[PDB]
Design a protein around this ligand. Structure first.
Ligand SMILES: *[C@@H]1O[C@H](CO)[C@@H](O)[C@H](O)[C@H]1NC(C)=O
Ligand SMILES: *[C@@H]1O[C@H](CO)[C@@H](O)[C@H](O)[C@H]1NC(C)=O
Ligand SMILES: *[C@@H]1O[C@H](CO)[C@@H](O)[C@H](O)[C@H]1NC(C)=O
Ligand SMILES: *[C@@H]1O[C@H](CO)[C@@H](O)[C@H](O)[C@H]1NC(C)=O
Ligand SMILES: *[C@@H]1O[C@H](CO)[C@@H](O)[C@H](O)[C@H]1NC(C)=O
Ligand SMILES: *[C@@H]1O[C@H](CO)[C@@H](O)[C@H](O)[C@H]1NC(C)=O
Ligand SMILES: *[C@@H]1O[C@H](CO)[C@@H](O)[C@H](O)[C@H]1NC(C)=O
Ligand SMILES: *[C@@H]1O[C@H](CO)[C@@H](O)[C@H](O)[C@H]1NC(C)=O
Ligand SMILES: *[C@@H]1O[C@H](CO)[C@@H](O)[C@H](O)[C@H]1NC(C)=O
Ligand SMILES: *[C@@H]1O[C@H](CO)[C@@H](O)[C@H](O)[C@H]1NC(C)=O
Lengths: 407, 115, 98, 98, 49
């Protein structure tokens, strides 16, 4: 209607999980051994085919270094490893689920351990290379980021880490979304209880539904599928009498042996080329995912983001990263209004021939009295001169109402 | 089972075989192999190089065993510096002074905020 | 045709139109509130007052010039259809994809 | 100069149009039909050749599922379908065109 | 050979369409569901709606 507004009288804090792939396994393929085994004649025939093998080697090396660079860019944004103080009191906030657990030798948070628990080819000249960053170092980076964002707020991202009490940091974040910090200071206990309950529910949601971690699983399955396809096509006839190279070598006359060897070569070269093209496409997709993850880490974790739906659903408050196999899990803490109540509103207040506009907030009425409240929370206040400015006359504004302005 | 001997695995490769003497079944594993990589500083800096046999145990073959592979020609040092030349699972090599030394890379300086 | 088959999209044109209509109705009646949670009713002039306050202009500017701003917006909206009709190249990206 | 500033005394509400492709046509091909048609011996030879048909079919199916996912992500932002009020008055703004 | 070339071209076009669709989804989330302070992300000028 032309004069009705709805303002929430309560709020809930919702923690959502966002999982993004970051890196994929680094694979190195030996051209000579894959395509020719241990026979020198086959290597001699492959020699004159040109420089395909070095091209494939360069492409695979580029993919591997790209994966390492993606992991480094996503996780190594912070410059100093921050350590949580031994006394773990943060004004009623419980971070036991996301902070590392010293008891377990893995030095991983319970959520990280749950994620890790939730989620042959060497025999034919195909090798997988170990990642540059071990899981321990990635967990260390994640713990450093968590300590920085818990003890220093967003200050460590833009420079040296600055001390701040956690309730004060949460008050500043509340001011970020247009809600006065009093709301937090008078509802600290309720907010902490809601946050703890949501954090507890995060683990239950992850454990009960395994489809949530489907992206990383799909990546791993795709890699395994590609490798299995390569190994299986190693046995294809490709128009030859037999797939075994040594049998042809010890069984055929040198010209027919050359013909069959050339056929097998053509088949294996096209197989390797297709595999490498698929690998490049998947690497591009993973690079896009890693760029998105790095952007989220820079914006959602190291600061407060005003972009809608970028960091969770609702008004973003903060975010917590969690290391995962070949990916990162973001816990977005968001502010969600609730318990809406409708009110009658007017654009401006007409007093002694002058309009009055709210400096911040809007004018609401409960039936007999007019108040001014902030947009996102319902705290009525007496309409006074301090929170209103006149800036105009009464006739021009449409929908103005008569009321007294206290002073 | 008594049928025959041509044992094979998911990789469509002759994993296991029976001999015409005992009916002993022997698993067939490929002879150890891998790729060799040369870790070198700038050529003008020095001509000393380090060789990394990736995925190869040092026993099969100064000599240092990394989880990435066997690294020969570099001496392992306990102190940690920033990564200069990537090697593998958390190990980076650099030319420090007169020789090439391998170390576990240091993530960064340890800073504790007095909260 | 020759073994090449085209799969129809899961979401029909009518369903995408309904999504668009729902988004438009939410934007018109609730501002940005429906995106961050439950939809909160608000008069459109006050929503545009918020929007002006966001870009650094006080809402008194909107309230003093409500009719002029409405006329300008209506004129621009009416001109958008004519601009799209005059130049078919505007959909060049979609046409190129097809 | 050291001392001069420019302040606007008016404004214009400009509406611009931006077109973005979202999804493309989902196509599936029958590898056996495309290569050999109804010839049985040709199909046997193709089966002897290798298993590229399954890989290509998987790639095309993945492409189709993405296209559907792209449309879902773009247009299914809202969880509830909103209806505009029967009276289309919004303080002088004309959304009949929209 | 022809069919594999077609499949590769389709995959590249699909990646391009992903990029475009991700951009479109981001613009829907930022421009339509809220007011964006990013310059020139939602039209030219100071974004309102
Ligand atoms: C609000 O006022 C306008 C002014 O003409 C009117 O058209 C509209 O119907 C009113 N809204 C109601 C009565 O809900
Ligand atoms: C807001 O919701 C919480 C949730 O339990 C409740 O405890 C609190 O009393 C509510 N505030 C009100 C009703 O003012
Ligand atoms: C956080 O919750 C866990 C749940 O088991 C509890 O054991 C722990 O004591 C809580 N933290 C604090 C500081 O009480
Ligand atoms: C609020 O909504 C109810 C039902 O939708 C309506 O009867 C009432 O008039 C509205 N306004 C107030 C101030 O309650
Ligand atoms: C409106 O608020 C005033 C002041 O709080 C109160 O005296 C009055 O009873 C309220 N009326 C209704 C209908 O809520
Ligand atoms: C009360 O509002 C009316 C407009 O509805 C106006 O004509 C009148 O002057 C106002 N009262 C006073 C005392 O100004
Ligand atoms: C492989 O390396 C491990 C690591 O020390 C060693 O214990 C083992 O003996 C090596 N294998 C052989 C066959 O020597
Ligand atoms: C600003 O003032 C200085 C001297 O006060 C003068 O040299 C300079 O030209 C002035 N700036 C411009 C843009 O003229
Ligand atoms: C601003 O431009 C509009 C366009 O016609 C005009 O009607 C209005 O008078 C102008 N305002 C000023 C203060 O010049
Ligand atoms: C403007 O509004 C009137 C009445 O609401 C309507 O008849 C007219 O068609 C609208 N303009 C356009 C371009 O649709």
């Amino acid at each position: 209607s032309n004069n009705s507004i709805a303002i929430p009288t309560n709020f809930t804090i919702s923690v959502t999980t966002e999982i993004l792939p970051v890196s994929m396994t680094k694979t190195s393929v030996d051209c000579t051994m894959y395509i020719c085994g241990d026979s020198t004649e086959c290597s001699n025939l492959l020699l004159q085919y040109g420089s395909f093998c070095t091209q494939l080697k360069r492409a695979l090396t580029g993919i591997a270094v790209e994966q390492d660079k993606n992991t480094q860019e996503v996780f190594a944004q912070v410059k100093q490893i921050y350590k949580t103080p031994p006394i773990k009191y943060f004004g009623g906030f419980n971070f036991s689920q996301i902070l590392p657990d010293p008891s377990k030798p893995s030095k991983r948070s319970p959520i990280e351990d749950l994620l890790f628990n939730k989620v042959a080819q060497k025999f034919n000249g195909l090798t997988v290379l170990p990642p540059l960053l071990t899981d321990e170092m990635i967990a260390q980076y994640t713990s450093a980021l968590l300590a920085g964002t818990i003890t220093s707020g967003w200050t460590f991202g833009a420079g040296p880490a600055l001390q701040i009490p956690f309730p004060m940091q949460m008050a500043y974040r509340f001011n970020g979304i247009g809600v006065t910090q009093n709301v937090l200071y008078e509802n600290q206990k309720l907010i902490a209880n809601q946050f703890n309950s949501a954090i507890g529910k995060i683990q239950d949601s992850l454990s009960s539904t395994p489809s949530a971690l489907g992206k990383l699983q799909d990546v791993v399955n795709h890699n395994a599928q590609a490798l299995n396809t390569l190994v299986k096509q190693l046995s294809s006839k490709f128009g030859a009498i037999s797939s075994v190279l040594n049998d042809i070598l010890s069984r055929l006359d040198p010209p027919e042996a050359e013909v069959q060897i050339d056929r097998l070569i053509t088949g294996r070269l096209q197989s390797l080329q297709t595999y490498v093209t698929q690998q490049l496409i998947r690497a591009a997709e993973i690079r896009a995912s890693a760029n998105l993850a790095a952007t989220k880490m820079s914006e959602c974790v190291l600061g407060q983001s005003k972009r809608v739906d970028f960091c969770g659903k609702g008004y973003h408050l903060m975010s917590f990263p969690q290391s995962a196999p070949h990916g990162v899990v973001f816990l977005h803490v968001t502010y969600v209004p609730a318990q809406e109540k409708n009110f009658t509103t007017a654009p401006a207040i007409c007093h002694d021939g002058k309009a009055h506009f709210p400096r911040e907030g809007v004018f609401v009425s409960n039936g007999t009295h007019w108040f001014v409240t902030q947009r996102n929370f319902y705290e009525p206040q007496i309409i006074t001169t301090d929170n209103t400015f006149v800036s105009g006359n009464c006739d021009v504004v449409i929908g103005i109402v008569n009321n007294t302005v206290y002073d | 089972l008594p049928f025959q001997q041509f044992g094979r695995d998911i990789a469509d490769t002759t994993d296991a075989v029976r001999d015409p003497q005992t009916l002993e079944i022997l698993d067939i594993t490929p002879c150890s192999f891998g790729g060799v990589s040369v870790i070198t500083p700038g050529t003008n800096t020095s001509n000393q190089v380090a060789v990394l046999y990736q995925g190869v145990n040092c026993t099969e073959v100064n000599v240092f065993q990394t989880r990435a592979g066997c690294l020969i020609g570099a001496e392992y040092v306990n102190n940690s510096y920033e990564c200069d030349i990537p090697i593998g699972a958390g190990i980076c090599a650099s030319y420090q002074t007169q020789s090439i030394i391998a170390y576990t890379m240091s993530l960064g300086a340890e800073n504790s905020v007095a909260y």
